[PDB]
Design an enzyme around this catalytic site. Structure first.
Site, PDB file in Angstrom:
ATOM      1  N   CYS A   1      16.054   2.994  -1.909  1.00  0.00           N
ATOM      2  CA  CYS A   1      15.304   2.247  -0.890  1.00  0.00           C
ATOM      3  C   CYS A   1      16.225   1.119  -0.419  1.00  0.00           C
ATOM      4  O   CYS A   1      17.428   1.358  -0.280  1.00  0.00           O
ATOM      5  CB  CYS A   1      13.943   1.828  -1.451  1.00  0.00           C
TER       6      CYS A   1
ATOM      7  N   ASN B   1       0.870  -1.203   0.000  1.00  0.00           N
ATOM      8  CA  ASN B   1       0.000   0.000   0.000  1.00  0.00           C
ATOM      9  C   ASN B   1       0.900   1.244   0.000  1.00  0.00           C
ATOM     10  O   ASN B   1       1.138   1.793   1.092  1.00  0.00           O
ATOM     11  CB  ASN B   1      -0.970  -0.055   1.186  1.00  0.00           C
ATOM     12  N   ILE B   2       1.386   1.655  -1.181  1.00  0.00           N
ATOM     13  CA  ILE B   2       2.309   2.821  -1.373  1.00  0.00           C
ATOM     14  C   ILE B   2       1.526   4.099  -1.060  1.00  0.00           C
ATOM     15  O   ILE B   2       0.527   4.375  -1.719  1.00  0.00           O
ATOM     16  CB  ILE B   2       2.909   2.840  -2.805  1.00  0.00           C
TER      17      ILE B   2
ATOM     18  N   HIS C   1       0.967  10.445  -0.611  1.00  0.00           N
ATOM     19  CA  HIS C   1       1.557  11.695  -0.049  1.00  0.00           C
ATOM     20  C   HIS C   1       3.090  11.606  -0.064  1.00  0.00           C
ATOM     21  O   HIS C   1       3.727  12.580  -0.515  1.00  0.00           O
ATOM     22  CB  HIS C   1       1.037  11.997   1.363  1.00  0.00           C
ATOM     23  N   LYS C   2       3.668  10.487   0.389  1.00  0.00           N
ATOM     24  CA  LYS C   2       5.151  10.337   0.457  1.00  0.00           C
ATOM     25  C   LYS C   2       5.736  10.444  -0.953  1.00  0.00           C
ATOM     26  O   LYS C   2       6.732  11.136  -1.134  1.00  0.00           O
ATOM     27  CB  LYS C   2       5.589   8.998   1.052  1.00  0.00           C
TER      28      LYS C   2
END
EC number: 3.6.1.52
Length: 166
Positions: free
Chosen positions: A102, A77-78, A81-82
């Site tokens: 990452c 669930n990406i 907002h980020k």
């Protein structure tokens, strides 16, 4: 040693002043020094290790952390907002050269780069092909679906005079 530079895991140039990789370790620092980075966009929530913090301090590199939880499929669930905040940093040329990373340089990094390609007007199949080249056997349909539906509207006004593609 002659052949002595070790780019980090899944390292690539994305565009003028923009790089992607997985997590650098000390064996990668001499290579990353050669890129004259101003910025790292770090997409994991875990604290930056001391080794990596010392490298940023010594090299005058600013850390931007937008921590996205590292779930496995199908429990991913990406958060929009980020990615949105990270794109705003990426689109400010004053932050270049910038390394996006990452842990593996496949999923979280792949999503941010794919959303950038959407702003650069790439067709979805070209964006997915680039994403798949890095993600390889760990390509997630959910990451490509995220890119498919990511709303670029808020960024339309931002000129991208930095890009090799005008």
């Amino acid at each position: 040693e002659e052949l002595h530079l070790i780019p980090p895991l899944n390292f690539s140039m994305v565009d003028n002043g923009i790089f992607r990789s997985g997590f650098p370790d000390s064996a990668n620092f001499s290579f990353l020094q050669t890129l004259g980075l101003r910025s790292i966009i770090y997409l994991c929530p875990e604290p930056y290790p001391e080794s990596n913090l010392q490298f940023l301090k010594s090299n005058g590199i600013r850390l931007f952390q937008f921590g996205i939880e590292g779930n496995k499929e199908p429990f991913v669930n990406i958060p929009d907002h980020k990615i949105r905040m990270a794109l705003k940093v990426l689109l400010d040329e004053k932050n270049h050269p910038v390394l996006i990373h990452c842990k593996r340089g496949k999923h979280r990094t792949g999503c941010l780069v794919g959303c950038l390609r959407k702003l650069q007007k790439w067709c979805l199949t070209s964006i997915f092909d680039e994403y798949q080249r890095f993600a390889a056997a760990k390509a997630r349909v959910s990451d490509q679906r995220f890119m498919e539906i990511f709303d670029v509207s808020s960024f339309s006004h931002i000129p991208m005079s930095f890009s090799c593609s005008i």
